[PDB]
Design a protein around this ligand. Structure first.
Ligand code: HEM
Ligand code: HEM
Ligand SMILES: Cc1cc(N)nc2cc(-c3ccc(CCN)cc3O)c(F)cc12
Ligand SMILES: Cc1cc(N)nc2cc(-c3ccc(CCN)cc3O)c(F)cc12
Ligand SMILES: C[C@H](O)[C@H](O)[C@H]1CNc2nc(N)[nH]c(=O)c2N1
Ligand SMILES: C[C@H](O)[C@H](O)[C@H]1CNc2nc(N)[nH]c(=O)c2N1
Ligand SMILES: [Zn+2]
Lengths: 414, 418
């Protein structure tokens, strides 16, 4: 059995055999499609962990062309002894590196996957305390930032055990600006992060109450209450946002951090759950420039840019919003390029993704892709992914959503 | 029950209408096909003239649904109608829709069209019955009157014209044109393309049929009409029925000097309308444009007009690398100009902000009174500036309800000539 996908711009047709190897649900049914549902739908027993581990070990030994070998059979037997005696098992380092990389390779929502095989993996499964987690994250940040020459990296903390002893980064990203609601309903800083900012303040953080406050890290080790730590400022690389033509643009006082570093997702390898696994790459311009200033729930310098462009903001059909949105994204890209901080534009990114998709179909038999997320948030139909049919399915290892840790944490102090 | 949520406003809607869905979407619990153009071939009936136990259960379902819609289920006229449909099938292997039934089903095929951001207008549809038509000449007369009515000197009105339903499959009525008004596309000797590059194949079929092409740049193609399965025939739409808007820009005086224009009336004519097992293979329908359809897809696809280049040139943009966003910037101006020209000439048009906001209101309406509204996020989100429109942050459920508009293969792949 085979499935085809067409590109209506180039007429190229690709044949997907890989979809046969997925066993995780997508959320759709035979009669309803849920492709635009954002999140669709305690810990693994012995009898559930055996076959999940078997599946992973099998695919790992297949990938290194050693399937059915004496080493393959010994590892399988060695894994079952652990599950049978301890109700869990420990990944080898080769297996951890392999699975982290393939979790990225399998991320159907990520346009950036042409880079998957160059992923620096930091094994932190020996960490025991939040001070330990802070050390590991600071080293991650320093390495990934590389003075502007950003490098992909993931840092993997101990796996879940019984669910009562989890490691979490409570931050959604390692570097984010605080947001403060004002008595008068206005907002200072980043409106996206208001909730987490209150959580920090309640935990004892002394907020500067400025426009671009780097939030503290809220780090949970082994199921204990989370603890606050200030990332050393000289580890946070930032780019002041200016425009190549509009000299007034710098006078908006804007800037953004250079390291996108997501920390709230859960890494699943062979049934093991790594509930704290911060990973980072580099930005596509529109994630700062379309959604991190111009979403209706964000900085809303859209109107200020349109005001400063003397645009007709009375009627929609003037397309001032569209027009000011373009200029902001031009400003973001020019800024990072000038300060030699790695960034990619949506055209260059989507073009690379198409090449990646083609290559993955050739050597792997398919490439799960989520069009709804792969298509950039602006200028969609003038980019080549727009006319590219795509198949979406869930392979493992994968990165999964998990609930916010304050919703489920049972506290310990006083 | 299934919930949809809008992440800007946190409005949550609860969907039970999907329980009435009949056809497969192509998706499974293990694979999603939502960006496949045609993911499923699940149809309600087989390839040609069905047997009784194939046609009648679909007719009963539709007749049932129509009489329920008017609070008359099990009434005298409903039981009579069922028997009448049974005897017609028993004696002709098909049946004929009453005019109320035809009007209901056309409007509900639009209401069910999950890809259409325009459906807040769905029940204001003018239905022209053309089921008495027997030749291409008659089809041409019906189509002209359709074009004149819908254009309405620029105050556009929605309309569909419905020709005789398919009978055995050999006597189909077809409009070979994909839309009623399209521009020719000429393949050039030096390899390039003049005109409009989607319609190249169709432009050649017209010339091959004897059409003498003026070989200009905005050459309204002729109509190519097939009646009762016969060879199709050429007709030239009278120009005074083809309203066109010259494109200028409110700010750039040099824009109009690109010598650019577009027609006011989008009229899709290659789709199939299906009601209670019946298939109307010729059912051209028209509304009015969202601005992006002209000026994002019909000027700025790579395999279409591709005159982003010239607009960027005259704007003196740096086209050396893509990080300058010269494509994005010229694409905006083109769309600013399209809206300006149409509004300046009092020809109906809707910008993508207004249309998406209308669609969000329409979803709420539909969930309040109908228990749901099937929507294809991939097609509802406009092709530019998606995330600054309200539909971008709106979850959607896509399911297939009948009556519906369906795809059908281009008739030159299946037509045996004479
Ligand atoms: C190296 C440059 C990278 C680029 C340019 C990139 C780009 C993107 C973009 C634009 C998104 C959509 C986010 C949004 O629209 O809000 C995304 C999602 C995602 N990225 Fe990448 N990415 C990169 C590296 C990585 C790495 C290193 C990983 C992990 C090892 C990763 C894993 C993911 C995942 C799991 C998602 C989707 C999560 C979800 O929402 O379900 N990416 N990426
Ligand atoms: C009145 C103004 C209308 C507007 C602004 C509108 C808008 C749109 C747009 C923008 C699309 C996507 C087209 C594309 O980008 O390729 C679409 C699709 C569609 N429209 Fe509408 N529409 C309108 C009226 C109608 C009417 C009157 C009908 C039928 C009675 C209709 C039936 C459909 C169908 C069936 C599709 C999807 C066809 C497919 O599967 O490709 N629309 N509409
Ligand atoms: C590694 C990485 C790099 C990058 N350059 N960007 C990324 C964006 C997201 C991401 C952030 C937020 C949301 C939900 C809100 N839109 C979904 C995401 O995929 C992510 F996880 C990882 C990213
Ligand atoms: C009634 C109507 C009005 C309008 N203003 N626009 C419409 C666009 C399409 C349409 C056209 C082409 C394609 C494929 C290439 N994009 C899909 C469509 O849905 C359509 F059927 C009907 C439309
Ligand atoms: C509701 C909607 O599906 C949701 O907000 C998604 C849509 N697609 C997206 N696509 C990307 N790349 N990023 C996003 O945040 C979103 N948001
Ligand atoms: C392959 C891709 O899904 C396809 O070309 C679709 C995407 N979404 C679209 N959406 C609209 N409104 N119109 C289109 O032509 C398309 N094209
Ligand atoms: Zn689906």
């Amino acid at each position: 059995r085979f499935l085809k996908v067409k590109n209506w711009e180039t007429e190229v047709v690709l044949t997907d055999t890989l979809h046969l190897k997925s066993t995780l649900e997508t959320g759709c049914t035979e009669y309803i499609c849920m492709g635009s549902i954002m999140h669709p739908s305690d810990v693994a027993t012995k009898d559930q962990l055996f076959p999940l581990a078997k599946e992973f070990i099998d695919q790992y030994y297949s990938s290194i062309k050693r399937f059915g070998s004496k080493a393959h059979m010994e590892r399988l037997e060695e894994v079952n002894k652990e599950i049978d005696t301890t109700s869990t098992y420990q990944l080898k380092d080769t297996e951890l590196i392999y699975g982290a990389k393939h979790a990225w390779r399998n991320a159907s929502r990520c346009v950036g996957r042409i880079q998957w095989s160059k992923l620096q993996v930091f094994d932190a499964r020996d960490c025991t305390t939040a001070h330990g987690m802070f050390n590991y994250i600071c080293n991650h940040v320093k390495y990934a930032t590389n003075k502007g020459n950003l490098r992909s990296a993931i840092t993997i903390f101990p796996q879940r055990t019984d669910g009562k002893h989890d490691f979490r980064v409570w931050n959604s990203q390692l570097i984010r600006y605080a947001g403060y609601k004002q008595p008068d309903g206005s907002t200072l800083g980043d409106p996206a992060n208001v909730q987490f900012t209150e959580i920090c303040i309640q935990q004892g953080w002394k907020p500067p109450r400025g426009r671009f406050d780097v939030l503290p890290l809220l780090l949970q080790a082994n199921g204990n209450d989370p603890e606050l730590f200030q990332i050393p400022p000289e580890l946070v690389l930032e780019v002041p946002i200016r425009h190549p033509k509009f000299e007034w643009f710098k006078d908006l006082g804007l800037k953004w951090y250079g390291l996108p570093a997501v920390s709230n997702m859960l890494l699943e390898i062979g049934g093991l759950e790594f509930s704290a696994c911060p990973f980072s790459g580099w930005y596509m311009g529109t994630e700062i420039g379309v959604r991190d200033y111009c979403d209706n729930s964000r900085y809303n310098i859209l109107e200020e840019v349109a005001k400063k462009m003397n645009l007709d903001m009375r009627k929609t059909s003037s397309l001032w919003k569209d027009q000011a949105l373009v200029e902001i994204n031009i400003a973001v890209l020019y800024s990072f390029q000038s300060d030699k901080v790695t960034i990619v534009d949506h055209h260059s990114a989507t073009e690379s993704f198409i090449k990646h998709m083609e290559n993955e179909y050739r050597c792997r038999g398919g490439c799960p892709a989520d069009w709804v997320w792969i298509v950039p948030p602006m200028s969609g139909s003038i980019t080549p992914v727009f006319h590219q049919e795509m198949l979406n399915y869930r392979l493992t290892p994968s990165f999964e959503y998990q609930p916010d840790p304050w919703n489920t944490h049972v506290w310990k102090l006083v």
